[PDB]
PDB file of C-alpha atoms in Angstrom:
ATOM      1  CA  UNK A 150    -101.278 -68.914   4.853  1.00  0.00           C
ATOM      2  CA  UNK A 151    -104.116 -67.994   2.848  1.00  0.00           C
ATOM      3  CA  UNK A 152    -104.279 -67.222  -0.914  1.00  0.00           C
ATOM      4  CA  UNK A 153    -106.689 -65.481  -3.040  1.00  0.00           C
ATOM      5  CA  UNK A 154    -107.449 -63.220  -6.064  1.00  0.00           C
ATOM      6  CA  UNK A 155    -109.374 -59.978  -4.630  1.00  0.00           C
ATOM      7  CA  UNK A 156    -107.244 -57.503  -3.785  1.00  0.00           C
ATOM      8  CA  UNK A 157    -109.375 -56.663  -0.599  1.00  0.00           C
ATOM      9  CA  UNK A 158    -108.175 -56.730   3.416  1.00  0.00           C
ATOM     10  CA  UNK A 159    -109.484 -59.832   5.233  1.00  0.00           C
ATOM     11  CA  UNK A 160    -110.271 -57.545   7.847  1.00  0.00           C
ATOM     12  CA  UNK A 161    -112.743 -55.461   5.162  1.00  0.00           C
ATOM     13  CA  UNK A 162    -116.425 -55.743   4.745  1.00  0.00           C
ATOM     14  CA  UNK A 163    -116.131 -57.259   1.392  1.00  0.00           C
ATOM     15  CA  UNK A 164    -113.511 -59.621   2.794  1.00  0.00           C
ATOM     16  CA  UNK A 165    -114.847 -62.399   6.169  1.00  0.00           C
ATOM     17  CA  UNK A 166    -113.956 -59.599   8.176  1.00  0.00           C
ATOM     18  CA  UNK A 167    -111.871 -61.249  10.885  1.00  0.00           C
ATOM     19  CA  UNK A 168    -108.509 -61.681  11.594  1.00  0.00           C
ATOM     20  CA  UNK A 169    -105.386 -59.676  10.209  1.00  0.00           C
ATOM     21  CA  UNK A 170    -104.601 -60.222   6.434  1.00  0.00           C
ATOM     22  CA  UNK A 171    -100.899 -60.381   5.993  1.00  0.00           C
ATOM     23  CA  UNK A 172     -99.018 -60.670   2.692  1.00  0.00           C
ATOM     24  CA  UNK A 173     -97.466 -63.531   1.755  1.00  0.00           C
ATOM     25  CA  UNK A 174     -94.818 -64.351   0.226  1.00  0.00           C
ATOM     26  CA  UNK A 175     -93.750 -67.426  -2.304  1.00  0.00           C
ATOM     27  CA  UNK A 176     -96.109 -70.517  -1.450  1.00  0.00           C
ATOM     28  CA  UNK A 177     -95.827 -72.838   1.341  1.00  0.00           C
ATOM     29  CA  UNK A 178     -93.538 -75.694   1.695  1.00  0.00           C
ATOM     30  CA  UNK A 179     -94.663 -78.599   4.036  1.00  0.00           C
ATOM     31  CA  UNK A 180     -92.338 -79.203   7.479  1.00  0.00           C
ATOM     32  CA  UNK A 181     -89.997 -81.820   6.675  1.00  0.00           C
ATOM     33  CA  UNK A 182     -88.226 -81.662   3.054  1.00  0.00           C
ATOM     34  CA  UNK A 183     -86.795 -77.641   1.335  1.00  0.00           C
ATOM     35  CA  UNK A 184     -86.270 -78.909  -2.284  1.00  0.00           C
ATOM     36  CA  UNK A 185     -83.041 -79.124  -3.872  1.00  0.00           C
ATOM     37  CA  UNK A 186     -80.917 -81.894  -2.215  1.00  0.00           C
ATOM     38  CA  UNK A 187     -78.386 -83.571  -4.398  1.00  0.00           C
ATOM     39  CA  UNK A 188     -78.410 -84.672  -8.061  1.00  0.00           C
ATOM     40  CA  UNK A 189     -78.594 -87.903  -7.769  1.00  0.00           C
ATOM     41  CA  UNK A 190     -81.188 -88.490  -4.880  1.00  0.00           C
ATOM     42  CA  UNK A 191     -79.618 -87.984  -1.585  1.00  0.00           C
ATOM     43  CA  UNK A 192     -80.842 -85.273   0.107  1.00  0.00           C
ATOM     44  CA  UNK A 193     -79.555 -82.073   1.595  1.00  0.00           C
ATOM     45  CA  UNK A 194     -79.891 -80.601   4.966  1.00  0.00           C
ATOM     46  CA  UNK A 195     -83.216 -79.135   5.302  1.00  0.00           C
ATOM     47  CA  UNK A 196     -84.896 -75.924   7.164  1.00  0.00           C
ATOM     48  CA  UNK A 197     -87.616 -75.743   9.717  1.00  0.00           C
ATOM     49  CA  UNK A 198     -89.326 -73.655  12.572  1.00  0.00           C
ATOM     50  CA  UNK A 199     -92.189 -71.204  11.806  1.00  0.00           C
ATOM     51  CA  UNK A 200     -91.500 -67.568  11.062  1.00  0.00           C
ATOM     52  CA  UNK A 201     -87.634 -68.608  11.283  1.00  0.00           C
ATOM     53  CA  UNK A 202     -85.907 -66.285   8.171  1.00  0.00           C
ATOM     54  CA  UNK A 203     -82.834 -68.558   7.263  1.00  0.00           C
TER      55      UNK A 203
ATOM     56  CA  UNK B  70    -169.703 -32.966  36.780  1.00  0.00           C
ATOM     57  CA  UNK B  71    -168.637 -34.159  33.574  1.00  0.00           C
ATOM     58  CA  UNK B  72    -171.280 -36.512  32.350  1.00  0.00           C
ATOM     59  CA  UNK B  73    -169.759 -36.548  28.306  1.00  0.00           C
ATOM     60  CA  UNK B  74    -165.830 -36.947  28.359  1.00  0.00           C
ATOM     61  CA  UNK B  75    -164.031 -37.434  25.184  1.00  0.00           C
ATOM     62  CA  UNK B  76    -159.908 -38.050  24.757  1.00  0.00           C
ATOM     63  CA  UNK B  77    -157.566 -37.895  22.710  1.00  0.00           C
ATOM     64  CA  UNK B  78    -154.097 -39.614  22.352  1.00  0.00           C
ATOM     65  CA  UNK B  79    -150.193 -38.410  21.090  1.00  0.00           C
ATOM     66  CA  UNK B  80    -147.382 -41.177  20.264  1.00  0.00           C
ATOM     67  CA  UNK B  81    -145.019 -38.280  21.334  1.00  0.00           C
ATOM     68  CA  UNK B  82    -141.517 -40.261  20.017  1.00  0.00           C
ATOM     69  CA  UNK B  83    -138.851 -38.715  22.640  1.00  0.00           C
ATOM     70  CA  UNK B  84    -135.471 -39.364  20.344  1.00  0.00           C
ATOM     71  CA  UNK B  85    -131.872 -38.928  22.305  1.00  0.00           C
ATOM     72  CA  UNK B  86    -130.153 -35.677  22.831  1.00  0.00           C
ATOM     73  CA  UNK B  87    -126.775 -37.543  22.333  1.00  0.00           C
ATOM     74  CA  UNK B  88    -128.250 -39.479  19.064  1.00  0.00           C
ATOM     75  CA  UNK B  89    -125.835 -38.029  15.716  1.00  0.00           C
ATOM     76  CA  UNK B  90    -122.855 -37.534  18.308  1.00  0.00           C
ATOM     77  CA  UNK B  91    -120.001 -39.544  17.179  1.00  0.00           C
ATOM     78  CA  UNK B  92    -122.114 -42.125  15.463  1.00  0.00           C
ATOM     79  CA  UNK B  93    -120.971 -45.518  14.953  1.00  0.00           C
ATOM     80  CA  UNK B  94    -117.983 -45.840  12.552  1.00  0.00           C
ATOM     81  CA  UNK B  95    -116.552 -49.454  11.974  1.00  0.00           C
ATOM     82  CA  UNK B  96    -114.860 -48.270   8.557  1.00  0.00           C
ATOM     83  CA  UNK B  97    -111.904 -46.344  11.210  1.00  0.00           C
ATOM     84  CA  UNK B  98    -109.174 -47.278   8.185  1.00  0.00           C
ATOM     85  CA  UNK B  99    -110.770 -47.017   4.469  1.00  0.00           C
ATOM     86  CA  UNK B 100    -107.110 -48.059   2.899  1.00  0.00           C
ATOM     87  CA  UNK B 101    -107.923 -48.663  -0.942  1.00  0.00           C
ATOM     88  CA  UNK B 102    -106.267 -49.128  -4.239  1.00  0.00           C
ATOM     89  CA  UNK B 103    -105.713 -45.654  -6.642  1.00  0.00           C
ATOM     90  CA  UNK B 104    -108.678 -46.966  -8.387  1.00  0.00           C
ATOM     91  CA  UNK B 105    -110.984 -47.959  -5.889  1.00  0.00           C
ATOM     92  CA  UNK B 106    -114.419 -47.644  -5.620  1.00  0.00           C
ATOM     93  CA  UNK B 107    -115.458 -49.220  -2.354  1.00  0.00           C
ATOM     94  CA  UNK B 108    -118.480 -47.725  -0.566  1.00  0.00           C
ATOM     95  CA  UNK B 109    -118.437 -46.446   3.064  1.00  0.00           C
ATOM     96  CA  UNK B 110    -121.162 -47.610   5.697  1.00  0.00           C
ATOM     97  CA  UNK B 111    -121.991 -45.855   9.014  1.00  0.00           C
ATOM     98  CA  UNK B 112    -124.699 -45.641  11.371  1.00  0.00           C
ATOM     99  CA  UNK B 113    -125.658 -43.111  14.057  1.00  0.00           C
ATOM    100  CA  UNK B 114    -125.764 -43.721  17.608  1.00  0.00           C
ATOM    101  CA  UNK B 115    -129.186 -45.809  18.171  1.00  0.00           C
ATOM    102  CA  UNK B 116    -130.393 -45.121  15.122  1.00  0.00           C
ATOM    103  CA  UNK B 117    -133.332 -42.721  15.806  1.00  0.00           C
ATOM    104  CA  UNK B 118    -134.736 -39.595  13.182  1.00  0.00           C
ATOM    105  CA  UNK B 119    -132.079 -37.376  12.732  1.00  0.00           C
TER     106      UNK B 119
END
């Protein structure tokens, strides 16, 4: 995941030109908690895997 | 015989036949915004006169 404000192709000349530039969206959790897991802290069942849409 | 000899010399520059035949294009997709402005680069095939 990369992020930045110029709307230009990372494969363009004005962009590092390598690679294929993807769109991405929301930002990126870290592997291991999701967010919301009870009120009072106990923790919910979390999601992994890479690419995985669940 | 030839007792004065003079000379003379010609940098004749022999450019290629196939030279501005399909030149070099590594703008294949030019995808832009409505908007854009973004300049195109290209060079011809070993870059000689023509």
């Amino acid at each position: 995941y990369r992020i930045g404000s110029y709307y230009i192709t990372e494969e363009d000349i004005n962009p590092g030109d390598s690679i294929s530039l993807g769109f991405g969206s929301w930002a990126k959790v870290t592997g291991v908690i999701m967010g919301t897991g009870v009120v009072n802290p106990d923790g919910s069942v979390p999601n992994a895997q890479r690419v995985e849409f669940q | 015989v030839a007792t004065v000899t003079k000379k003379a010399s010609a940098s004749i520059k022999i450019y290629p036949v196939v030279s501005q035949i399909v030149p070099k294009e590594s703008t294949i997709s030019m995808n832009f915004n409505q908007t854009k402005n973004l300049e195109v680069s290209l060079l011809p095939a070993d870059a000689n006169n023509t």
